[PDB]
């Protein structure tokens, strides 16, 4: 009722209470990114075609090989707007560093709330240094989710994932350059195709260059189980 600027009410569901979101946002260069948490179809995409010109199609890869291994991703300071980005291995990230909902991908989108580091649900908006997200993961079906993405305190999308495939590295489904390089073996986040990321309410925030991707009702299987979900593709 008081302080009318909070309306982060746009289906960030799955969190026992809203006090489970970590909300440490700075916008210190004053660019408008933080306003995107609340105003969703306003992204200025005029710089984007340049940003994603930088990323290179799956066509740069070669059939053959056969011995797919796994490797830890780099986690370069590049924003992970590109599919090919090899996430850093998922870990224990302090809530002191993050702004807005945190999503992991099973592939289906899921939300992680702030916990005790022991693992007990915290309800302090992410203020105390005892508030963290535990994102350690293993690929489903046995594991929990393939990877997670969220937002920096200062307007940078962060990415967290299971080790991409080797042989040359593939963190999504690139079945054309090897028939076992499926998503279920190599998927490390929301990108299930070099052209398709999964849809969730904060995709346009975290992945704002995907503004014009089309949204499809799809079906995927990790070890035979069926996830119905929606994906955005170009």
């Amino acid at each position, epitope marked *: 009722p*008081g*302080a*009318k*600027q*909070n309306i982060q009410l746009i289906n960030t569901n799955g969190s026992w209470h809203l*006090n489970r979101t970590a*909300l*440490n*946002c*700075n*916008d*210190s*260069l*004053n*660019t*408008g*990114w*933080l*306003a*995107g948490l*609340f*105003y969703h179809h*306003k*992204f*200025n995409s005029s710089g984007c075609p340049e940003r994603m010109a930088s990323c290179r199609p799956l066509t740069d890869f070669d059939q053959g090989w056969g011995p797919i291994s796994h490797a830890n991703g780099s986690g370069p300071d590049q924003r992970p707007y590109c599919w090919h980005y090899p996430p850093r291995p998922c870990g224990i990230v302090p809530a002191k560093t993050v*702004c807005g909902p945190v999503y992991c991908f099973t592939p289906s989108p899921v939300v992680v709330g702030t916990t005790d580091r022991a693992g007990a649900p915290a309800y302090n*908006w992410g*203020e105390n240094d005892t508030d963290v997200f535990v994102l350690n993961n293993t690929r489903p079906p046995l594991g929990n989710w393939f990877g997670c993405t969220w937002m920096n305190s200062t307007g940078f999308t962060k990415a967290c994932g299971a080790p991409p495939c080797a042989i040359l590295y593939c963190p999504t489904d690139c079945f054309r350059k090897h028939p076992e390089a499926t998503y279920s073996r190599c998927g490390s986040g929301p990108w299930i195709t070099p052209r398709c990321l999964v849809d969730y309410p904060y995709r346009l925030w975290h992945y*704002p260059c995907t503004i014009n991707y089309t949204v499809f009702k799809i079906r995927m299987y990790v070890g035979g189980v069926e996830h119905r979900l929606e994906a955005a593709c170009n």
Partner: antibody, heavy 125, light 108 residues
Framework: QVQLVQSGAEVKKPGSSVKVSCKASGGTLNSYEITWVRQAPGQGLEWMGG???????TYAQKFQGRVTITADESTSTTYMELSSLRPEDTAVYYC???????????????????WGQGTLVTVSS | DIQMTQSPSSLSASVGDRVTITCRAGQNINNYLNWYQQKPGKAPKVLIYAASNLQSGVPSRFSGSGSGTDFTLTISSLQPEDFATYYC?????????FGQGTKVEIKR
């Protein structure tokens, strides 16, 4: 680092109206939390009204039914128009971003960053 | 709307004197208070957000405090650049309001 450039100075006869423009640039959004303040020569700052990127407006009661604010997202320009002009309204008119800029402890804080250069509206016969 | 009143309305001090200015609001405003400085012939520049946080770049001698209905902007070792008018601003209603101002001049 958004940037607000305002229209030129204007001279108006009493009773007419003036519409001032605020072109935004260099930011992440197409439209921003644009706010308008005037300051009569050698006076304090009078807040007038504001508009959010959804374009929902809000006006001070001193100026109600007088001032209307519109945007044009096509040009990232927002417009302040004040009607029934009287000499008392001679002032420097300011646009600024009232951007949401820092969140903590559950609460999120706006304030005024990019002030525009101001434009002077002299109202006199 | 929601009245703000600053005190004093204007003030003179020598380089060095510790200076305090106050804002007060008609209802409770939590820590949703901003402070701007305006030098003659220029638009205002923000100084203090969320009652006590200095905008990047703003020197250490500035300092906000307050919560509720009472706020105090204070400079300690006044220096040759701080010569100006200082407005406080509530940012808790969507109808923003300003204090009438406080001009700060140099005793000589």
């Amino acid at each position: 680092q958004v940037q607000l450039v305002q229209s030129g100075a204007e001279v108006k006869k009493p009773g007419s109206s003036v519409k001032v423009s605020c072109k935004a640039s260099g930011g992440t959004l197409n439209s921003y939390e644009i706010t308008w303040v005037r300051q009569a020569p050698g006076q304090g700052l009078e807040w007038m009204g504001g508009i959010t990127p959804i374009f929902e407006t809000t006006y001070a009661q001193k100026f109600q039914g007088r001032v209307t604010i519109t945007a044009d997202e096509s040009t990232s320009t927002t417009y302040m128009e004040l009607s029934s002009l009287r000499p008392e309204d001679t002032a420097v008119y300011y646009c600024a971003r009232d951007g949401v800029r820092y969140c903590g402890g559950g609460r999120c804080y706006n304030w005024f960053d990019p002030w525009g250069q101001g434009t002077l509206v002299t109202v006199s016969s | 709307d929601i009245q703000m009143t600053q005190s004093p309305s204007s003030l003179s001090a020598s380089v060095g004197d510790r200076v305090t200015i106050t804002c007060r609001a008609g209802q409770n405003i939590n820590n949703y208070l901003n402070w701007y400085q305006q030098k003659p012939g220029k638009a205002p520049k923000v100084l203090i957000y969320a009652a006590s946080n200095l905008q990047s770049g703003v020197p250490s001698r500035f300092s906000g405090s307050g919560s509720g209905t009472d706020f105090t902007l204070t400079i300690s070792s006044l220096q040759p650049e701080d010569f100006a008018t200082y407005y406080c601003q509530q940012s808790h209603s969507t109808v923003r309001t300003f204090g009438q101002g406080t001009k700060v001049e140099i005793k000589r």
